[PDB]
Amino acid sequence: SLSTEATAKIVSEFGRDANDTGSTEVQVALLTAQINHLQGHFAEHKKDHHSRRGLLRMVSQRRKLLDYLKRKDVARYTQLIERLGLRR
Amino acid sequence: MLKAGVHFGHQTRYWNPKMKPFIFGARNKVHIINLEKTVPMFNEALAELNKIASRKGKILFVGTKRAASEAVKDAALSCDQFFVNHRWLGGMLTNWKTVRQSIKRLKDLETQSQDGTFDKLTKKEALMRTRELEKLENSLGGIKDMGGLPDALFVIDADHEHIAIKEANNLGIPVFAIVDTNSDPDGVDFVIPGNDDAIRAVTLYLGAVAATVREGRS
Amino acid sequence: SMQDPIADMLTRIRNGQAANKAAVTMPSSKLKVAIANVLKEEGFIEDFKVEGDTKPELELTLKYFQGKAVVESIQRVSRPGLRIYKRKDELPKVMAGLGIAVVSTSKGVMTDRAARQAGLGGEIICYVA
RNA sequence: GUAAAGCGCACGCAGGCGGUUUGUUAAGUCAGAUGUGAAAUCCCCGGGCUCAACCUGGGAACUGCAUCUGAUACUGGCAAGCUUGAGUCUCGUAGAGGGGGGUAGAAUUCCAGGUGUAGCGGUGAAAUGCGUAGAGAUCUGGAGGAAUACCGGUGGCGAAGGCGGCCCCCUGGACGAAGACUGACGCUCAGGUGCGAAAGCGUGGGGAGCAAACAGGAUUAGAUACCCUGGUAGUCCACGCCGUAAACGAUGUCGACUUGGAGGUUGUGCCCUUGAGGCGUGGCUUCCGGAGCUAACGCGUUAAGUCGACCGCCUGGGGAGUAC
Ligand SMILES: [Mg+2]
Ligand SMILES: [Mg+2]
Ligand SMILES: [Mg+2]
Ligand SMILES: [Mg+2]
Ligand SMILES: [Mg+2]
Ligand SMILES: [Mg+2]
Ligand SMILES: [Mg+2]
Ligand SMILES: [Mg+2]
Ligand SMILES: [Mg+2]
Which residues form the signal peptide (chain C)? Predict the structure, then answer.
């Protein structure tokens, strides 16, 4: 999946504080990680469809996370996108 | 409850979710009947039993099984009670009209041996027809005298006697039987959650009901 | 997923009844209580309790008359994705009267009879007969 | 499920549905009232032509729309939460899950040489065929492609198709455990997007074995077959296309309930485990079977039982999944 190091690292850079892995923001971040890192792996092989399934899931899951955030706090949503350069 | 402490549970681990409300535990990989509520059962049974048993209550003790067999006879034969311990004929209760016909044949067959009405035909025939009485006195013997369905019946185990019971409740005849784990209570209307075997266990309640029944005759 | 908690409660009872189960349990909620109450006031269930503090439970005891169960039939009516509202002069008559129809009125969750008399209509919930 | 009928399978926008608590609102909803809903029909009661048909007085009804005044249980909106739904983190567990690259051994075939000599191969027999130009058998050396005995299973993993030697790298999912965190972020999904056995198609490779086509031999009345001797496509590879199958459990997905028995597989708490073991407790999975369901066969806690949310589909046979 993801490296424990980078995992914990990104946990604070967005976590509401410390060791609070679960925040709508935290998740999105942890998601975009593998989401972007996988592309590098997918750029190659390409025919690894079965692994794509996972990639796509996290992709859609992320959208469902952001969509929610924006609904529960337009603030964090607009700010979160920036630190990740998401939303086009 | 006294002598009741001589049978406890029975059957390894096959039971039946229907006997649950009567099971105590299962020490040593074996279900143990809840005798703590078994004796109380005896009341409703032994009560209603002697009740109708008063007016020459036609009681039918059933115990086709081996163990109880040799015993079941004495019990019912200790008063105006009848018994059946040899392969319950198919319909000897419901199809009585037809079954009784065999009884009559048996009756007259006895008279044959009774007086000089036996010494007839070649030894072959005599020896031939004699065999007939043998089995007949087994499958219909302990019931030869009972013109008409019994007022009730007390079957040993509700399992091995599935056929017998099936007819009883069909003729609207109250059923009294000892059920346990593997047994199916949905049949008998008077649940007697107790060991379905154990030479001692069977004789224990066998005569027990016999007495109350014979005693109920004033 | 639980898109209809009311249905669960109802089904829980009928399923239990036929199962001879002594009593039934489930997560309580304002509405569930009101229904369970009417079910008791009408003589369909022995009683009912609500255990738990932070997590509400609902000790609903079933009732069995003779060698049979009291609730011979209980089905949901005004279910989700298809609501049902009637008028004072519309309330259905369960089992020609021998039955009851729990209807939520602006005055509370009462039985069809009561509602019809109070002159107010509401939302049906089930037809316990 | 087998009668017509579950998209081959997933992700998911619109749409439909939405755990739990308090407050608030009052839109749906309920109540009251006010407009209006033409008269005639219809309906009830009552009249008038001798009766009836017919005519007529009154009421009812017009199941509807709008306004106003309330009621607030439920649904909807809003506010603040909550944690059991869903998800996140930590640590493990098993796995023929997927993509890429290596590599080993058994065998077949082919090439070369040795030994050796009249058969071999095949069938029901045969025959075609291969053999004295020396086969077959036997041994040595080499080339090459494809597939991985045993383990292996009532087995495992995957959404489905499907995935078996061993090794490395990249990668997806599932499960348990203690717990820690977010706080309804959920379920379903027309259209859409993507995945899709085999056969087939395009380009360029590869080609041992097997084999549509094709050619012989045999069989038969015939034999455009089955059988035998050969053998091209293809089967293999890379990339692209084709989207079908009895794509089947002929059974859509998610969730909650409802007696049992025996077994497989994988995780885990606890107990002199002295030894395996015993008390359990999650995930996945076989077989039998109760209630109930079923036209029956049968299904049966992995339901085809009892219920809820959403979806797809059926409406007599042939013509025809055909024509346009
Ligand atoms: Mg067919
Ligand atoms: Mg069909
Ligand atoms: Mg399918
Ligand atoms: Mg009018
Ligand atoms: Mg509300
Ligand atoms: Mg192919
Ligand atoms: Mg090709
Ligand atoms: Mg599986
Ligand atoms: Mg079965």
Answer: none
Q: Nearest bound ligand to CA C31?
A: 5
Gaps in chain C after residue (C–N beyond 2.5 Å): none
Method: X-ray
Nucleotide D321 C1' to residue B7 CA (A) = 73
State whether C63 and C76 are in the same domain. no
CA distance B79 to B217: 9
**CA-wise closest residue to B211 among B6, B2, B35, B59:** B59
From CA B171, how far away is CA B176, in angstroms rounded?
14
One-letter identity of residue B90: G
Dihedral sign, Cα of residue B141, residue B144, residue B146, residue B149:
positive
Resolution in A: 3.2
Query: Tell me, in Å, how far CA of C24 is from C1' of D140?
Result: 85
Which tokens hold the place of B26? Answer: 């299962």
Closest residue to D91 (CA, C1′): A4
> Is C64 found in the same domain as C76?
no
How many angstroms separate the CA atoms of B78 and B64, rounded? 18
User: Residue type for C15, please?
Assistant: N
